[PDB]
Symmetry: C2
Subunit: 204 residues, 2 copies
């Protein structure tokens, strides 16, 4: 297990998100879904030129998996995934410029999507986030952070995913509404209704 400090601007952003009240928290799910759709576009695109890109799974979809007993909500997709270098250095699209711009605006949280840093909105509702991912060019890895300025990265030895990403939200005790069938369905209807990939809720 390797532990890393966040980029300064990312540490800054995560604290602002965690330590300030924001009403319109439900947008975290829009952001996670939007990320999944983007990752699905990227693998689909690659597969046009080279169909073997889909040897790791042909299906292109997004699954929402609430678990009341674990108090986790997990957003799963069969997108391009992330390599170890992605998990350590962050994605090219997440520049300190997008971050800095956003924080200044903050001081609606929904504008977070605009700036490439939508993932961090998960920390509106979750005390810990685990990201398990498999990119065609790399091994399966787990990235995890409870915020507080650091994250971890390890090779993942669990269940194989073929290709794609699972984002596991370990929810805060006052944010269990996001585990409810009715609530998840209304959020998807309001913010993610025209996403070009099937979104399936795994009812408990």
């Amino acid at each position: 297990v390797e532990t890393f400090a966040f980029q300064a601007e990312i540490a800054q952003l995560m604290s602002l998100i965690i330590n300030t009240f924001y009403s319109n928290k439900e947008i975290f799910l829009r952001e996670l879904i939007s990320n999944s759709s983007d990752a699905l576009d990227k693998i689909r695109y690659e597969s046009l030129t080279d169909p073997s890109k889909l040897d790791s799974g042909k299906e292109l979809h997004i699954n929402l998996i609430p678990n009341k007993q674990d108090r986790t909500l997990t957003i799963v997709d069969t997108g391009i995934g992330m390599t170890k270098a992605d998990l350590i250095n962050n994605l090219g699209t997440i520049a300190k410029s997008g971050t800095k711009a956003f924080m200044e605006a903050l001081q609606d949280i929904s504008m977070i999507g605009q700036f490439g840093v939508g993932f961090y909105s998960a920390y509106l509702v979750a005390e810990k986030v685990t990201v398990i991912t498999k990119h065609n060019d790399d091994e399966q890895y787990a990235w995890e952070s409870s915020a507080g300025g650091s994250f971890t990265v390890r090779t993942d030895t669990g269940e194989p995913m073929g290709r794609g990403t699972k984002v596991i939200l370990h929810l805060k005790e006052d944010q269990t509404e996001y585990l409810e069938e009715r609530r998840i369905k209304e959020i998807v209807k309001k913010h993610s209704q025209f996403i070009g990939y099937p979104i399936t809720l795994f009812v408990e």
Copy 2:
């Protein structure tokens, strides 16, 4: 015809775009298409609760119209459109915040879309941009700017368009490749292939 000053940060960004060399200019079309898709999502959403929103036209689509005689490329959609207030005040999601820090990041251009000011990438290729638009709640208007720090807004008495927006790019003399069928086809393929509305490229 009313003439308005640009927001200082928008005026600065437009100067940067016009007066700086950038290589990967084709991304202007991805940005215009993205905006059209977003405008279409918006009217489609409103129609779900109120079918009469589509009295101004039920078809939800995007047209690309090269004109080699006029040296214009026109991006048309049947999306929600913009009101006169939108044309004067700008859109709520275009704010100095996303603008100011993006310029700093510059000093690839493709990062523009992820700061909510993707429209202005049109000035990479166009010496003037005319925007004709019709929203359910307003009259038809023409917005136009050749940059230099100002824009114009007037009623458009011309061809009644139903609902939606036309973005007319009056291309620079050295940017006429964007009128060629093959070039437009290839740009849509690389960047807008999975947009969830029909994109129709007109033949000349």
